[PDB]
Amino acid sequence: TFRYRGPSPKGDQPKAIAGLVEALRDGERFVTLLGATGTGKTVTMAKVIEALGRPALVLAPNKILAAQLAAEFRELFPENAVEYFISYYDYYQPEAYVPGKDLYIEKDASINPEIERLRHSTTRSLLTRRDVIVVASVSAIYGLGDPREYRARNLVGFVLFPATHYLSPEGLEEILKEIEKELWERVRYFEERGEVLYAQRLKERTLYDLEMLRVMGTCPGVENYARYFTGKAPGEPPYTLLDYFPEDFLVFLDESHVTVPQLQGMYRGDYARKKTLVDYGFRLPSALDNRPLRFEEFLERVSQVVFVSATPGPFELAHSGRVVEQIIRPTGLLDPLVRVKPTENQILDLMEGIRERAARGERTLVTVLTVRMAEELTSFLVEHGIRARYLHHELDAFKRQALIRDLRLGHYDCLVGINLLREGLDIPEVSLVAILDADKEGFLRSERSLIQTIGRAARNARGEVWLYADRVSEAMQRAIEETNRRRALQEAYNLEHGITPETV
Template sequence: GIENYSRYLTDREPGEQPATLIDYFPDDWLLLVDESHMTLPQVRGMYNGDRARKEVLVEHGFRLPSALDNRPLRFDEFNQHIHQAIYVSATPGDYELSHSPKPAEQLIRPTGLLDPPIEVRPTDGQVDDLMEEIRQTIAKGHRVLVTTLTKRMAEDLSAYLMENGVKTAYLHSEIDTLERGDILKDLRLGTYDVLVGINLLREGLDLPEVSLVAIMDADKEGFLRSEQALIQTIGRAARHVDGRVIMYGDNVTDSMRRAIDETNRRRAIQQKYNEEHNITPQTIQKKIDDGLRSIIPQKESDKKPKLNLKKIPKDEYPALIKDLTAQMELHSANLEFEKAAELRDLIAEIRHTM
């Protein structure tokens, strides 16, 4: 490919920095980085990731050594181009804070919403306790997010909730972007009442219908239960006036304590501002749209199952239900919980018309 020869075509020395679009910007350009706690580490990792892939290709003769110089910028090279920047994040990292003499906090929301209250509960009987909380939340017409620490627990919990009649979806890494958007839309519409996930219930999820976020194994210190990760997860409950968070854990880790203290600090500032300005918090009103589906044609295989019951004799309904139930159980056994839930709803619709 052309990456073998780009160094020669641009007359660069081995290891020399490649040209990028940033080179075309004027000296006074401004960089805005959204979700900087996630974006900057990605910029840092691009060079090493690219080099690791190409070194294998070079070693086995699939690329020339010069291909290594057709690469992303190293972080220090990237920084040489940055003269002024705005980093935006609810959980800025050490780099952003060290490069911001006076960080600007934006804690007050136009809706007056507060950061959610947080409760820590023991893990003994946590599933039964969660089930009761879910039922109470659903009874109010609200939705629930549950974040687990492992894929196995997410699968088991999703299956358990479905077996107990809770309309549940499982959000995992194998779901593509379009399907992920469909699941989130269905949660808002009420097709599902509960969404279970691992590390996917964080940045970019604005779900005003969600009033309860449950964090399982909150006391297991690590990347998924770091202060930053916990604060981001807690924030998913900050779109609803009744938003709240339950952490299940037998100990309060340092990360939990810092996340709880920071959330309480922000909540106190927001509460004081509302009192001083006579503001009553209101749940965010957000239109439910088709997202990417509105601009990308839907494949036939992506469409949900539909039946025209008027064309099916009622005496065939029992056999139809039996067949659909077998399909539903097969999907459930294969951990395809979304497809199983669609068939479950279809079966319920048929039974309703019998």
């Protein structure tokens, strides 16, 4: 049973919590929390989890948001089990083969113990208590050992659980025999094609593993033999973390318009990578059975799903039996004013706007559509007295974070990039978001993308978004209307409750 110790619900949180709880108690399979940025979606989720008293899985679109959510839930539920099911995939290199460079890359070995420790802490809690909230990136949902074996194998002071998720040795001996049978069939496949390099590679690698398994009960990359350990038939879905949860667990897909497509595309993405290792003889075809689930398989293994997003995608909108909105922010801050400005003199207009703001301690974010434009605009702004940096698309998560962190701390005043839909860009000091080529085609100028971009100006009491365009596209029109709908609802709530916005 959960014990919430966070802030009491404010703004639209009370009504949203009640609407979600009511739909779930009524048996709705799919429900959406349509929550604007800054409305406190984590507290809403927390209160729903508390009310229903069922273990929960929260999936995030990337490792940064996953870690952040885990940290927040930990603070909100200090006496319960908050777990982070991290994957080595997030920070270390997996096994891979790059054909174009005829390059084989070994998986990183002897990694930071904290990774495996977090995964085991997750599975141990799921088997010992019901007050568990597990946060993970979607990528973490992959093949994992049989929960039955993991559960049945314990030592009893203190109950000690396994040190690995791939126990199930059944008859290691009969298991090793079945793997070797596949090996020689596959070697014959290569020999018949004249591909003796592939046959040799597969033989050496597989026989090495079989010997290490025989003399150690395990080997590096043992997960590749998952199917043999779990007894699953070829092509059948593998066991995953979902199987370690009690049957009535609740699933939240945060940033659902991003996570649902990630869940839909995971199987194919992984298949392309693994199939390559198989085609060149590094792995047996059975390695393809240690994989992510297809979206349909994932849906068969969950019972109720809450999609959370400020801009729900097509799946959520077609399938949800209820949509609950949360628009009013606990802080009372308003969605920004959105202006449309001509392209003539747009750069001089923008530079004047940026310097006016920098003079009073306010920051500006700018999105453009090409790398040449981003490079050139950034240099132009710097030559004209502005502390501007360019958020290059090749920066990795840490680098982006460091660069963004420096804006949050005020080292510079303006960040220019192509894709601003990055984590950490919700900074109170940002009072202007400028969107060049606002009317042009492309993912970053879609109705949803514009709404998400506009939201980066919603943490400041004077936030504005400037759309440079000489025409209004349907995406611009609908994003401006939605921003205005939200702002008006927020102003009405503030006027009823005697609240005047302020920047923190």
